[model samples]
Target: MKIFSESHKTVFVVDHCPYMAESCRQHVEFDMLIIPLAPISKSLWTCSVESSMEYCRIMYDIFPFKKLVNFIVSDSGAHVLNSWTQEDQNLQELMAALAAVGPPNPRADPECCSILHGLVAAVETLCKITEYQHEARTLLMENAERVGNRGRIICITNAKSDSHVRMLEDCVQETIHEHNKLAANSDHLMQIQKCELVLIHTYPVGEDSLVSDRSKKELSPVLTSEVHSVRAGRHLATKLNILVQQHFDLASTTITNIPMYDVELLHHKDAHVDFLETITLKWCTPRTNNIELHYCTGAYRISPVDVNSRPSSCLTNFLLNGRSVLLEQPSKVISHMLSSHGGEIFLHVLSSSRSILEDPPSISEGCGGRVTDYRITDFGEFMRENRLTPFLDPRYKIDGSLEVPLERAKDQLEKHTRYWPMIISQTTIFNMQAVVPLASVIVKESLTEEDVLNCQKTIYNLVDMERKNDPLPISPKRDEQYRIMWNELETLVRAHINNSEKHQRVLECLMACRSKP
Candidate 1:
């Protein structure tokens, strides 16, 4: 099995070159009033640095696996900012140090622009993470119950006029060679992307042409009638793709253009957390620290006919591993079904929208919209008519775990006025991902068995497995390890025996299949 990093160790090879200091948003005014503001005066380098800070903050709150983020420079022999001060420890200090970093001078030195050594050092930094350096079996035994540290080298830079094209090319080939060489030494399958390296450009990555620049030119001639010139930047991007793919341990290279990786664009990407904030906050930010989003009341879209199946009539009848829940279900219920194969586990629950359950406004029939309307509606009715009840009206309710994060959404919900049939809730024996839903049933009304069947819908998001989907399974599979120890101990037991009946039993027990792994 592949052994990875215990924590995601990251290295940032930010090319602080003069080209990166060029304007991120120079002269562009065709956009809207609120837009074009961020790019007007800012240089690309400033954005890259500051955004890396933001990326760290946002990433830390989500993953927390990243213990120390190593900062590597581009122009000056890959100088490390954290070498002496060790500013990589805390987010505040890290952010402060990075913020204090000045932009590269307008007239940057060409001599200092040789980033080959920097990129070379970037690879060197990966060695510190050291996964491929050892055999997977040895590392596997050492990493007992833990995964390895996360070795991710995120390099953001501009591929300026380079004198090291041959050098860069050789390094990539050699990089792959070294890794593969370790594999033979490893006495196992493969090694890598424990050191996944992503190369992002300083330009508008995903925004322009609605696709990446590298990908646009990489397209086949048959796919596009227009011809692409022997573009230099695209060529560079293309070459880097192979290096990156190989370093990333890929059989294929991603052809998409280098992403416009400016962090400002990333800001718009549920970025929050203060108590994991309703799990909705994760929607705000980033993940393992994930799965809480699936912690609320469950809902699984069963089938077309069952999208919003009424509770009473269709509840008892459905499919899951051949049998049904006898009522609606969570996801993954095979024996729970046919003993069947179906079910779901909700993370949260809230009242359905009023627009779906209640009579929404239709000006065509109401006095508000009709010409000869004669209904003498009160003034309150007028405001109430247009002022549809909010989703969070005190009258409305939610059944969830956290209060702080939902408080914001609840603020927005207070503005709508609509009625929704109660969402049919199933409880008692059925659990949510083996986790019990803590929010109690709505206490106001709609609690009767009769009310449950006809008044509400029971459709929910389906979940096949519990939150056990974090790529690596926990280190519970120890059959081989057990077997290995069993053999060693069996030999020891044979050595310890002194040719007596009492001692013979010890060797017999040690060698027996039932006692052995």
Candidate 2:
């Protein structure tokens, strides 16, 4: 008797059909197999009865030469095996041994196919048999628990059954789900998709193509072209044996992919906690046509681990300790942090537009004075020059939320190398762009058309003045003046921008004024 170890167990759910006799050579390839064969017909039960017995005898003869396998043979209750169950002393003994299990029940549909029932029974039998084997081994031997309680099922059929194939498919899926659940609770990952169904006689050899036309049409939906193919007799058996071996080998390699460490802890870290050691926020304004328009802030929290929680201990250690030991330059830390954490950052979109001044009407009165416009430089070089090591690259949100060093450390003050002033510019520009109207509505109840015309004349004069005063030479001051002019226009509209009626009236006045000019 071959020792029935966990991994060693394999179940063969063979279809009982006369057509299977054509590929009898392949059937022997299953050394110690679990064969679940049942009859399809009640009326013509004897038709395939003798043929199935011959097929069984063919497999039984080949069982000895098989490497190491256990056999479970259950047959249809057609009374063909009944004579053997009575006349043959050995068959009688075998039937008695299976008496507790009893004979499989007869199908309700007399003319239905037996493939689906046979396959499901095979799976059930494998589980029952393996459970018995495991318990018996555990009681009799030492370290029998080490033998995995896992097995593979190979179901060979010939689509002779008119029964729906979905029954078999559902059984396989349910088996896999149970197997996966068992593996999840166990020490090792067990292979669940190990059940292989081989459909033969369905695809007959053809002259033009390897698969017959009937095979292609009938079997295409159930069996894929690769696994479902022409029967090459012994050749087909040899290929199947090799395929099974390959599948086993592939499954062995997949055990390492399972998270071997404390899965619960890993899951919590992945889902909730931040993995990175340092709260590093690295961002750069994206350049448009080689010009950095409106210093757009892109902020990300620096962490040792990535979104997937996979870590680089080398980088994590360097960031944690390399700061003190190594000649830690700000650039070096920033560069290494970028490399360790991967060039991925959580990109926060403009959630909502904010008021230009938090205090609104009161604060809006004070010209927030040409907010310190800073130049974007190569961050690596800037960090190195400034010696901004322990506290490095500055970052800010679009809402002027400041993130800066605890101590004030700036080489220049007039230029304002800080986050506040820069954030003001970011917020001011974002808000100004939020509500842009064609013309400003003063919203005074007593205001007249003459007043609107006067306001229009003033804007026209300003436009003309700016056009005339705008010199061919463009300088920083010129740009500053242009920005102030735009902000002034924005400020005028911002007051009444929310009043839809007033805004509409202003637009109407602009259109009326345009019609005249």
Candidate 3:
């Protein structure tokens, strides 16, 4: 047998750098301690699964002949195997064993290699590596999961800029990927328009060429696009040379670009509680050109994670495995498919919209109106009724009403909206945007707009109420109509010039007035 045969050789390569093996080869080109290598012929080659124990023995007894490595930036891909640093430890142990020779050499003792030491240190190293792997594994896994679980909330404000449309498409792809993986029910995917923030770019009659049809066309790849009727932004305000202009066939506007990303937190399935505590929020914003007289500004999106109770062991493990598999060959295409947004207000509207779309007449028959009416009250009530309150402060829930942390309440609502459909129907619910009108009808009958406005004047009481109730101050985005109304009021009152003092003063007054509510 040719012990140093050039025709039969096996090389195991490992490294922490890309060009590591090249450097090793350069230095070992003339080294006799290492054998001259040759490729194994296909006829004689036999491959068998390498077991950890077997690997331990061979690795310890014989020095590693070749090592090639690719450094990983994040624990996203093969980088996860980065912690397999047992090569050095095993080498040291093996050197100790061989030198023990016939006699126990006391110092180079066989007891040191008594299997116990190797195993003990191996276990220790294993535990340390495992913990390291686990921590990084958990964080990355949670980052993807929590962000994915949110049932993506996207806000596409103005279509005036093609960049905005591009951003929206990128976000859509991300949400689609996330939804496909976590929820996996195509039936739940949906796209809804929300006016959380309406972006309208209007100019004088025949001011500029219609926003390049390119943007409208781009949406075709992701969703069905329809050209709505072109309308002006009310002539009077524009004629008076106001800040907000009006344009006919004005570039399309989007208040809420709902990028659905509903996730089912398989609770009944083996899961961990600490893993549940992790929270993640995703946001995307696009900028608009300043000179474009009638161009609208891009949207602002921010979704925050605020889970008080952490995920448990099962959940953490599940996420680690799930994330690893998902991120294995993460392409820009995949990443694009899995992103979503955070400014989804009418999260409750998703269920109704789905039902309405699925069976419109049935929904209309069940309630006087279609899904809108059912959602306005019924769905809100369901969330309130099912409000998860583990512990309550007596001062807040004196009437036995559940008093959860404001953050918890938000999370509960978000979580149920995300996963409840899967649990109840084994079907994922798409996170769609539904507009919640600000002050439906303004309620000026029994209470005049003045009385309504006056309540805001009580700032001290506003602070007091917040302290007593422990809730975030909720409000709506000022719609185009609302903004128009205010600007008209401002113009009518002739308050533009004098440092906009009157407008500022009125705004402050309005805020103060609503403080009592």
Candidate 4:
């Protein structure tokens, strides 16, 4: 039951045109040049990628946790620079992958660069990465706005054409329409992932062909009107408020988006929402459509409604293979309040989700070290093996008084999915002066459905809809040649690391200490 999921997915929409081959502020040092690219010479494209790499490193705690830069090149067409997923790939790995993603050979290619395709490809990419996540989300998690992807498209380019500018003006405007219509769309949950376009425009080389000439002509605090609009020309029609310094590194600084990045780094803690486990909650009502309730950290509110009614009776009709099992809210029961607080006992469903997709009857329970593997079949039990804690909720009793019967109920339910029919009984033990109640029941229920319907926390009433599936598309950079090229590039990087004296020293020290232990 992940109440919040703040995975910040930043996708880069870069202009890899021949024009990008021009120098920005050259002579900046880089991590060792790739043996292949070292001969190709550095350009503004390298600088842009370098800045991205530097910013990504500054955000070191941020787990790409994907690749640091998901490059959607905007030179002639929309294409992903790297198609592979870099699981735990960090800084040095970022350098290698980006070296292969070039800004194009200036001597060979023509001058027309189309950034619109890049914008579309970027939005499309974000949408899918956003969509695949809700695969097993509950109504509560869905309603929690933070649970969705926080997609930030950092467009670093120098193009200022009608097409380059307006296409962003137009396409992202459509995205705005999509968000406005978000209310009617699925989840109301949220249609597409929440996104914003951050445009960072790098400077072009001056007339004398010297990269240092930028200091003389540009970044002077004021510019020619033509250059002024070129720098601050377009404004997006989307609700993106954070569009500043798209032209800062246009002269003075080597690092792009510095003006905007401190604010960007301000959201460092948002990466905490874990998607390792997805869960959803639901309830079916008699009159209206299924009542959707989300445990969102924030968004909707659980109002103080007039739950006007008397305390009701409770019952549980337990059956095993059509045979009766005796035990429940019984005949000789003594219910009283203690002169204390904190008492909540319930049969929480522990049913993960409505439709859980699985190949076999086992789960690794990477939720811990389970921190041990917890497996379930009919009359199921846990298997100790793995916390990053599966399902990630501490107080959430995974295999407790609630979980045992559900898996056994699997024999009756005859399905391979989760069902949340929590039977809860919480006592409102008030010790303070006027905490509103002397002695009361927050939620007291039995297995029987009648009494629990008004309780609102029963969970049995909600029937979550089936999980939907539709994979997204990928726009590759060079179609066929790029693959083997990148594959070989990966080999070269491994060779580089293997031969690296510095890295080897670190590795040797670790091996020595670990081996000694």
Candidate 3's displacement at residue 515, Å, is: 24
Model 2 weakest 10-residue run by lDDT: 260-269
| Candidate 4 residue-wise lDDT, 196-308, digit = tens | 44555555433231111111121111111111111211122111112211211100111111111111111221111322211221111112223223222211101001112
Best by lDDT: 1
RMSD of each: 27.6, 26.7, 31.8, 31.9
Each candidate's lDDT (Cα)?
Answer: 0.38, 0.35, 0.26, 0.35
- lDDT-wise, the better of 1 and 4 is 1
Which candidate model has the greater lDDT, 2 or 3?
Answer: 2
- Separately for all candidates shown, the number of backbone clashes (residues 3 or more apart, or on different chains) is 55, 3, 42, 22
In order of appearance, the predictions have TM-scores of: 0.35, 0.26, 0.17, 0.35
Candidate 2, residue 364: CA error in Å?
Answer: 99
Q: In candidate 1, what residue range of length 10 has the lowest lDDT sum?
A: 261-270
Better model by TM-score, 2 or 4?
A: 4
Q: So what's the TM-score on candidate 1?
A: 0.35
Q: What is the lDDT of residue 333 in candidate 2?
A: 26
